[PDB]
Write a protein that binds this ligand. Structure first.
Ligand code: R78
Ligand code: R78
Lengths: 299, 299
């Protein structure tokens, strides 16, 4: 056990238990976007084996994230279990993934937390309008952890990749002018992280039918315009391919970002694509177009 | 809902959930008697309907009371349910009783808390030696509650009376020289609180067989010597009678203080007797003898 993780599991557990008692209305009030719950814990000569002795836990806008979870088809108990039944696994910007591979837990700066607060209402409204059908990150919770001296902020999102089906290739696409190539140290890992020019060079094709491709690009258009209108940029399209003839039917209700290949595909492939890395604030305007140009071409 | 109660239920719930994860050894260490766990909670614009916005909860020596509960045959989950499933009921020195009538919850002074800390180790050792078979109060938990401005201390004990069988008469016996009579305002309540001279005047007899009477007085002797040796005094014998031919078999494993009447008793009676009010610190020495003289006579 690493203390900051134990506090997170402890905290998510506590937070979801509290909410289970709250009466949940259909609507959020404007105050729900300014809300939080803090808990400070001090154990003197008690419970040394599991928890640290002195820790704080803060949940931002618990009602908003409760409402978002349900809008994204996530039940609070399942969300609880996925984060609590067993520890989240590391990858060390480092991230953790829930033991069941459903959720990602990433450390963010206080600046990112400030930007999240800044866009949360508009983000929530967007999710309402598109009925939760989007390629944007699905934000599920946001927390502050303190363990004697160290303060960190985390956000929780839905995993873009599958919780069963492995992924043998991964891309990260921005469609920028500034030459985007991968480095060689990455290449030597179980799954590297290829970039723009690796794609427009290793002759990578995505075999999805002309309907699936139409829906996707329509979504992508709306999402990216929303991102641009908030003056956000430097986001990527995360692309991940699962070869069936290596490890292939999936659950579209769990692996919500999956798209099957069309019938004429050279190999049985499942694609996982969504937008990631949205919280940084040449400009945002053309970045969106430049992003849309690129993806329209490569797909 | 009265806020201080909600905090207590909340707090007992939280505390028992924490312990459920702790590995419980057979032995307590000396540090366990100096231990505690504090939790401070701040909700900003959140959860107004159930909890107060700002409260603190402190549990003293959680390991000791965990150990005592089990020694008194109380399971932590049942204890939890009894205090949490529905609110405790008032009687307003005021007290509350769990909704299932199993437990008493009384407010105490910081001075009482200090005295409890002072005697807890010796008290625990006494419970070990008598294998939990005693007429002393069964202390099950001790807490501090804060709700914005107001700080209170509570202790939890097992109810001397039954959780089913009603009680139509109640005495409170010290066996003092100083004339002990009841007042008339008490008499007009559903169950008054009669005192020494009400007993040695209304010709009250306790019809228990000569064996039951032998065991009881032996216990009483040991208990009271223990109390005296801690320089404690001003405790009473709480006596409560249940007439079967008004409202009578009981569970000796729940109503642990009950004694059936012998076969020749004029009416079918069940007696509930135990020591109460021990935490005040002419002297303690003879008070014990004086107490023992009286009870030997009246029983
Ligand atoms: C909130 C961060 C952001 C985001 O916005 N969302 C929505 C997101 C959703 N899902 C994922 N999923 C994964 C993305 C990359 C990897 C990956 O690179 N895995 C390798 C596997 C082999 N080896 C152990 C080394 C690492 C694994 C993922 O989950 C299995 N990542 C997301 N990211 C990324 C993660 C942190 C920065 C970008
Ligand atoms: C920790 C306080 C102390 C103690 O040490 N123990 C062990 C204790 C264990 N059990 C009890 N039980 C009851 C004792 C008295 C009464 C009683 O007087 N009830 C009336 C009933 C009708 N009406 C609503 C008005 C009040 C009810 C009890 O439980 C049903 N009391 C105890 N007391 C006493 C309680 C506070 C001071 C003395």
């Amino acid at each position: 056990s690493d203390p900051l993780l134990s506090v997170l599991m402890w905290g998510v557990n506590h937070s979801i238990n509290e909410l289970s008692h709250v009466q949940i209305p259909v609507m959020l009030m404007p105050d729900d976007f300014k809300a939080y719950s803090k808990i400070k814990v001090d154990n003197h000569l008690f419970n040394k084996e599991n928890m640290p002795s002195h820790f704080k836990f803060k949940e931002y806008c618990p009602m908003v994230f409760r409402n978002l979870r349900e809008r994204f088809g996530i039940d609070d108990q399942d969300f609880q279990n996925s984060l609590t039944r067993s520890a989240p696994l590391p990858n060390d910007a480092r991230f953790h993934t829930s033991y069941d591979k459903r959720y990602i837990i990433k450390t963010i700066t206080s600046e990112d937390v400030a930007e999240m607060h800044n866009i949360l209402k508009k983000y929530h409204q967007y999710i309402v309008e598109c009925h939760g059908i989007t390629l944007l990150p699905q934000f599920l919770g946001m927390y502050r952890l303190n363990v004697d001296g160290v303060e960190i902020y985390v956000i929780v999102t839905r995993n873009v990749f599958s919780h069963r089906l492995s992924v043998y290739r991964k891309y990260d696409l921005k469609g920028s002018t500034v030459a985007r190539e991968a480095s060689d140290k990455e290449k030597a890992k179980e799954l590297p992280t290829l970039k723009d020019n690796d794609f427009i060079n290793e002759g990578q094709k995505i075999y999805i039918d002309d309907n699936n491709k139409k829906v996707f690009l329509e979504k992508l258009k709306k999402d990216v315009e929303f991102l641009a209108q908030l003056k956000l940029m430097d986001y990527s399209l995360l692309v991940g391919i699962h070869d069936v003839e290596r490890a292939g039917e999936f659950d579209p209700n769990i692996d919500v970002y999956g798209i099957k290949c069309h019938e004429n595909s050279p190999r049985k492939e499942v694609y996982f694509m969504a937008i990631i890395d949205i919280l940084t604030h040449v400009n945002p305007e053309q970045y969106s177009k430049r992003f849309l140009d690129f993806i329209g071409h490569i797909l």
